DNA sequence: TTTTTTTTTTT
C-alpha cells in the first residue's frame, strides 16, 4: 500500500552503474529525443536499489504497471513539454525476471504470473489492429446516439456488441463507427522450444505469443529470443459451446530480447595481437586433429568479403566452400561446429531437403483459398551461413534450383499466378563424397567428382580430402583418445566470445583494396588461366568468377584482423590458400 | 457406511514393509519435501491390512477417494504446516486392481467401475487447460455482478453458461472472467491393444484416455502402459443432436504405470559371477544353434558404449551391427529375439518402410491445411534400438536417408517451409542377403556385398554368414528337433530378468578408459591401417570410425559386468572380436 | 485446379 512512484523517480534520477555514469538518466534523455515511448529497466538493478520495489513488480504486475507508467509520463512531461500531443502513453518493459520456466513445464499454477520463456521464433503474422474502445450508434429512429460501449473498462479479447442502448434503454441494432474507435497495433507469433530441452523421442512444442503497440516487428523468424509476459487462456469461438470446456494458453508479451560495452574492448584487445589470425584458425573445431588448410578455409567463409552495390548491378560478397572427401574424414563434424559458432546459420542435409523447402514454397491456405509464399532455408539464412551436408545425394533436377541463389543471391518464383523475387544473400558451405564412395587415384578427376561444371564454378574454394593411412596414424589415434578422456586443448578462443568477434567484424569492418594488392592479384589470375588451358578435360574451369574469389578472400583476411584496408600481406595469403585449392583438384603451378 | 479415514491414516503409519521397514512412512516425507502432491498405494497391501477398506475403494471409488484425500491432506498439514499455501489438494492413486479387462471385451456393464487396461500408447496431445469452476459477469446495465456459475458442483464436460443471473434473476449477456476462473491441466492420449491380443484377421482396437493434473506427460508414444480409472461415454458435439443416440467411450485415468529394489539385489547378485559375460551370451537366442560370434556381437549392441558430450561437439556412443548371409541362416529369428529382450526396440523391414517413415514425414494437416512434422521410426527409437531387416531390399536412393541419423544421430528436414532438427540417438542392427541371394566364393567380396563404402564404414561390425553343409549337420538337426519337442536349454537367464539387467546397466554404469587399455587399442589401430594400405582393393575402409568402434566395444564389455573401469582384459576382448570381423570380410591379420 | 510431400493407383 506504500507509495512507489516517489521511489521510482528517485531510483531513475539517482542510480549508479558499474561504469559510474548514471545509466538510467541517459535512457530517458534519449526517450524524449527519439520518442520511442518505451523504457528498458533491468530487474537486477531495481532489486539492488530496492528489494521491496522489485518484488512488487513480480507479484502485483497487474496493478502496479499502469501506476508506475503514469508516474514516468509525468516526469517526462516535466523534462520536455514537447512530448505532449505526440505520445499519449509510455510503456515500461522489465527484463531479467528470475522466474524462468521451460516451455514444456508450464502448468495451471503459472497462469496470471509474470514469467520468462526462452525459445525460437518460427512464425510471424502481418501487423493488424485491435479495438480496445469502440463507438456505436443505436439504429432506432428515435435514438441517433453515440456512446463508447465498454464503459470504464477496455474492450475484452472477444468483441461484444451492446444489447441495451445506454442512451434510451431500448434494444435494437447498433452500427460501429470506425472513425471514433480507438485502435492498437496487434501481431501474433509462434515460439518453439529449443532442441536442447526437447525430451527423447518427442516432437518439439510450440507456444503462441502476442505482440502489441511498439513491440511489433521486433524480430524475424529463426531468431532465438527471450519473452517476458503474462500467460492466459485463448478464446477463439466462445459462441459455439460444442462441449469440450478445454482451452489453450497464449502469452501477452511485455518485453522481448533477441540474442555490452565491455565486449567491445575485449574484441579490440584480441585484434591487437599480431597473431590473431592464427589464434582464430586454431580455435575452429578444436576436437578435430589436423586439416589445417580446411580450418583456414572455413574461417574465411565465416567472415566473408565485402558486397558491392552499384547503380546498375550488384556483386556477390559471400564465399562458398565445397569439400569432397572419403567417408570418416570428419567432414560433418566441422560443419556441425560451423553451424554453432556462426551468428546466423541454417543446417540442412542433401536427402532431407527439397527444392521448394530450400528456396521458397507456394502454399494454398485452405480457409482463404489463396496461395502465398513460404520462406525457404536460403531465404531464412539471408545475411548468414547456409550448410548443405551430403550435397552429392541430392537429385540433379532438384539441385539446379539453387544455381541462381548461389550467384545472383535471389530467388525467382513464377507459380500459381505469383511472381516475386526474394533476396537470398547467404554463404553456402557443402560437403559430399566422390562418385565411388572413396577417391580413386587411378581415374581422372572428371569421373571422380560427378558434378556439373556449372555448380563447381560457383564455389570459391574446392578441397578434395583423401584418407591416406600413413605415419600420422599414431598421432591421430593419440589425439582422438585424449578427446575421449576429457582432455581439452588450451589457449584457444571459446565459442561464445568467438561468435561475438565474428558479429562485430562483419558489421563495422569494410576493407579497401590498395594498388599493390591489385598487381599481385592481377598477375596470379593471368597465370592461373594460362595454366588451366593445358588440360581442357578437367571439370574445373577457371572463369572470371575465380578472379572475384581472390578479391573476396583477400578482404576476408583483412577483416579477420579488423584492418581497414587490404595490404600486400593479405593478397599473399589469398594467393597461397588458392594455390592449395588448385593442387588438390590436380592443377599444379 | 462407516468412516475409514481413521483406518486409512493408521494403515500408513502401521504398515510393515518386506523387511519390516514401513515402506509407506518414508514416502510421506518425500512427498512433503519434494511437494510431489501425489501419493500411490498398492491394493494387495491394503487388502492384506483390512479387507473392508479394499472393497470400499474397489467399489465406492467415486465417493471414498475425496474422503481419503481430505484425511491425507490433514495428516500432511500437521506433519509440516509449510505444505499449506503451496498445494491445496493431494491425490491418492490406487494400483494393482484385480479388475483387469481386455480392450476388446469392454461392455456396457463395466461403465462406471474402476478397471485396469494394459495396452500400447500411440498418440499424445499437447498439455491444455480445462475449466472446473468458472466466473461470469452479467452484462446487463443494472447487474455488473460477478459470480461462480456452477454452484456447489464441478463444471461438467460440456461448457454450460448461466441462463438466469442468480444475483438478479434476469437473463441477458454473461462474460467469462479468466482471472477468477479456476483451471486444471488436461491431456488426451490414445491407447492400443497389444499385438498378441488382436484376434486373427482383424485390426487392433483403440481407446481414448484422459490424463489430468500431475498425470500429464507421464509417458511417451510407443510405451507399454497399465492404466486404471473409470470408463465413461464421450460427449463431443452435442449442439445438434442429429439423431444417433450412439456414443463412444473413454477412460478417466486415475493411475498409470510404465512397463524394484528387490530386482536390484537380484541384478547385483548376478554380476558377482566371474563368468557373467559368458552366461549372458549363452542367454541370447537360446533356440539358435551355433553362431557364437554373432550372439556375442548382438550382446554388445544391447549395452552400447558411453556417449560423450563436449562443449563444442558430441560423440556417438551406440554400436551398429550388420549381418550378411545366405537364406535360412536364422538372421531374422535372432533379430526378432532382440526386439523382445531390448528395453526399447523398433522392428522395421526394408521393403515395408520408406525414407519419410524411417526418419520424419511432413504431412499437411487436413483441418487447417498447414504442414507439420511426424516422428519416424528412428526418432521414436531414440535411446533404444532400431532393427532394419532386409536392408538390401531398400532402394539405394531411399536408403541414403539414414546416413545422417546413423553417425550424427540427428534428422534434418527442410521441406515446405519447415526447418527442424530432431534427435535420433538409436543403435541400428541390420540384416540382408548377398547380391546373388547366396554367397559366391568364386567372385570377390566387393560384388558379393553390393553396398556403397559409405554405409559400410558406418557399421562397427560386419559379419558374413555362409551356409556350408558339413559334418555339423547332424548336431544342427538334433538341436532343431529337440526345440520342436519342447525341450528347453537350462542355465540361462530368463528374458524378463535379462531385460531388467540391461536397463539397469545402461542407466548407472559409465566405464572409463584406463592407461593400459589406451596403449593396447592404439597399437591395434595402427596395425590395422598398415595392413589395409597393403591391399587397397577390399570393400572395407579402415577409417577413424574404426578406432572409435574399439573404444565403444571396450566400454560395452566393461558395462556387461557392471564395471566402472575399462581394464586391459576388456581391451583384449574388444581386439579379439574385431579380429573375427576382419577375417569374415577376408581381411587377414 | 494447383503446388506440395506423400502413399497410392492410374493416368
Ligand atoms: Mg558426414
Ligand atoms: Mg530373414
Ligand atoms: Zn438508443
Ligand atoms: Zn444479473
Numbering used by the authors:
A (entry chain B), B (entry chain C): 7 to 265, 275 to 604
What's the publication's text?
This ring performs a helicase function to separate the two complementary DNA strands to be replicated and drives the replication machinery along the DNA. The helicase/ATPase rings of eukaryotes and archaea consist of six minichromosome maintenance (MCM) proteins.
To examine the mechanism of DNA translocation by the MCM hexameric helicase, we determined cryo-EM structures of a protein construct of the MCM protein from the archaeal organism Saccharolobus solfataricus (SsoMCM) in complex with the ATP analog ADP-BeF3, magnesium, and oligonucleotide. Despite the differences of the oligonucleotides used for complex formation, each sample showed highly similar behavior with two distinct structural classes. The first class of structure is well-structured throughout and binds a very well-ordered segment of 11 nucleotides of ssDNA within the central channel at the ATPase tier. The sixth ATPase domain (red) interacts with ssDNA at the at the bottom of the staircase with just one hairpin. This subunit also loosely interacts with DNA at the top of the staircase. Specifically, transformation of class 1 with six subunits engaged to DNA to class 2 with five subunits engaged illustrates a dissociation of one subunit from DNA.
